Amino acid sequence: VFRTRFTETFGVEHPIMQGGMQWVGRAEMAAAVANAGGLATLSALTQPSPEALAAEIARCRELTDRPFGVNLTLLPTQKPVPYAEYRAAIIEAGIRVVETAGNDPGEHIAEFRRHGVKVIHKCTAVRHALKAERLGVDAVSIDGFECAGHPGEDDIPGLVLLPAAANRLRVPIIASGGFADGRGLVAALALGADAINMGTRFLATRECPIHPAVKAAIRAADERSTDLIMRSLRNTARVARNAISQEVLAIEARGGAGYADIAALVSGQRGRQVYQQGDTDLGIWSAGMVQGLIDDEPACAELLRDIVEQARQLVRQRLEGMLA
Ligand SMILES: Cc1cc2nc3c(=O)[nH]c(=O)nc-3n(C[C@H](O)[C@H](O)[C@H](O)COP(=O)(O)O)c2cc1C
Numbered sequence: 001v002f003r004t005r006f007t008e009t010f011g012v013e014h015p016i017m018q019g020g021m022q023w024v025g026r027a028e029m030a031a032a033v034a035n036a037g038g039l040a041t042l043s044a045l046t047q048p049s050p051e052a053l054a055a056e057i058a059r060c061r062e063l064t065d066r067p068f069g070v071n072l073t074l075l076p077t078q079k080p081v082p083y084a085e086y087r088a089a090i091i092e093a094g095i096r097v098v099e100t101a102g103n104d105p106g107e108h109i110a111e112f113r114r115h116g117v118k119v120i121h122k123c124t125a126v127r128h129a130l131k132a133e134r135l136g137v138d139a140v141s142i143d144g145f146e147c148a149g150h151p152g153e154d155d156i157p158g159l160v161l162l163p164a165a166a167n168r169l170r171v172p173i174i175a176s177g178g179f180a181d182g183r184g185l186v187a188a189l190a191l192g193a194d195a196i197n198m199g200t201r202f203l204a205t206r207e208c209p210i211h212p213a214v215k216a217a218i219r220a221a222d223e224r225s226t227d228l229i230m231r232s233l234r235n236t237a238r239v240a241r242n243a244i245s246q247e248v249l250a251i252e253a254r255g256g257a258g259y260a261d262i263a264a265l266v267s268g269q270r271g272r273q274v275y276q277q278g279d280t281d282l283g284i285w286s287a288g289m290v291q292g293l294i295d296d297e298p299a300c301a302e303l304l305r306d307i308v309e310q311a312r313q314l315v316r317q318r319l320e321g322m323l324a
Contacts, residue, residue: 001014001308002014002185002189004189004195006139006172006194006195009118009138010120010138010139011067012037012038013038014036014037014038014304014307014308015185015189015194015195016039016185016195016196016197016198016307016308017038017039017041017120017141017174017195017196017197017198018033018038018039018041018198018202019041019071019099019101019122019176019198019199020041020073020101020199021043021071021202021203022043022045022268022286023043023268023272024043024203024208024275025041025043025046025071026042026043026046026209027042027056027060027063028063028208028209029042029207029209030060030064030068031060031064032207032208032300032301033068033202034067034068035064035066035300036300036301036303036304037304037305038304039097040069041068041071041099042056042057042068042071043070043071044071044072044073044086044090045072045075045081045086049082050082050086050089051089053070053089054089054092054093057070057090057093057095067096067097069095069097069098069120070095070097070098071098071099071100072098072099072101072108073100074102074103074104074105074108076102076103076235083108087111087112090112091111091115095117097118097119097138098112098117098118098119098120099119099120099141100112100119100120100122106135109121109132109135110136113136118138118139119136119137119139120137120138120141122140122141122143122176123140123141123143124142124150124154125154125161126164126168128152129165129173130169133169133171137171139173139174139194140169140171140172140173141175141176142158142173142175142176142193143176144156144158144162144175144176144177145157145177146178146289146290147176147288148199148200148226148286148290149286150237151177151236151238153231153234153236158176158177158191162188162192163191166191166193167192173194173195174194174195174196175188175191175193175195176196176197176198177288177290178288178290179197180198180201181293181306181310182307182311182312182313183311184290185307185310186314186319189311198290199286199288200218200287200288200290200291200294201290201294203218203287204219204291204294204296205298205303206297206298206299210276210278211278213279214275214278214280214285215297217240217280218240218287221240221287221291222292223289223290223291223292223293224289224292225240226238226239226241226287226288227241227245227246227248229245229249229252229262229266229284230248230266232255232257233252233257233258237286238286238289239284239285239286239287240280240285240286240287240291242280242284242285244266244281245284248262248284251265265283266284267284270282270283270284271283271284271285
């Protein structure tokens with residue numbers, strides 16, 4: 001329906017991407033999005049070892065014959081992670097596109113480039129997107145304040161961050177954070193982006209491999225039901241508001257709090273159980289304020305189809321109508 005610099009550059013049907021999703025970004029998710037016409041990604045670090053990732057890629061290929069990418073998130077953790085080996089596994093597997101995120105991606109970007117693997121780098125500021133562009137990425141994903149996950153510390157929403165980035169960048173731009181439907185798509189495109197990336201919206205789909213209680217929580221949640229944890233540590237993350245995030249906020253409020261004082265609460269091992277068991281209070285789980293615009297659970301195929309058709313109608317009916 002839409003042809004943009006994004007669809008042309010990455011060879012996909014729709015200007016819609018399903019970026020990194022720790023714990024959730026497995027074969028079922030990626031295959032559903034790939035089969036739906038969008039740019040899908042398997043979460044590399046969701047797999048416990050480079051070998052596990054190779055196997056997951058194979059499993060995904062059994063569910064879809066269409067190409068998909070892999071997200072490589074650079075954890076600021078101190079516990080050694082065989083990043084180099086994960087990269088090697090991604091390349092050896094024939095992956096043609098990778099979405100990198102985190103600090104100091106340079107080393108990985110260069111390696112991927114040497115092997116003809118395109119790179120999309122998720123950034124939270126214009127200065128970061130520019131540095132990434134100078135490093136040679138194929139596109140930049142501009143994550144705004146609205147996003148689930150790490151929005152950085154500048155607190156600039158997409159309405160301003162996107163045009164600000166479009167004013168300076170040359171490579172294609174992917175808008176990320178706060179998008180869920182055709183209205184968001186058109187807004188993103190008008191602001192200077194060539195596609196939209198979504199996370200929360202994909203949690204609320206039939207194929208997303210998570211407990212039905214989580215999908216129900218997203219539908220029931222309004223736009224004001226998310227918390228920004230670890231702001232006092234300059235490691236801000238937007239998560240679903242629950243007993244855990246609220247407790248983390250209480251701890252930070254007391255002042256003099258360090259990561260060690262919350263490591264047990266924000267634990268990833270604890271958060272992954274939210275998606276598996278469906279207990280939304282077991283731990284911290286990512287969700288964006290965009291949940292307030294979500295109240296259904298379509299199959300990924302119809303979802304993407306409806307988004308582009310809605311966007312098309314907004315242009316040809318609503319907007320052109322105002323001009324007539
Ligand atoms: C459950 C969940 C897990 C996520 N995991 C990661 C991750 O491991 N790495 C990363 O760079 N972004 C991660 N994200 C962020 C998304 O890739 C995307 O940038 C964000 O969801 C966009 O905001 P939206 O939720 O409003 O669409 C995650 C988001 C969700 C909802």
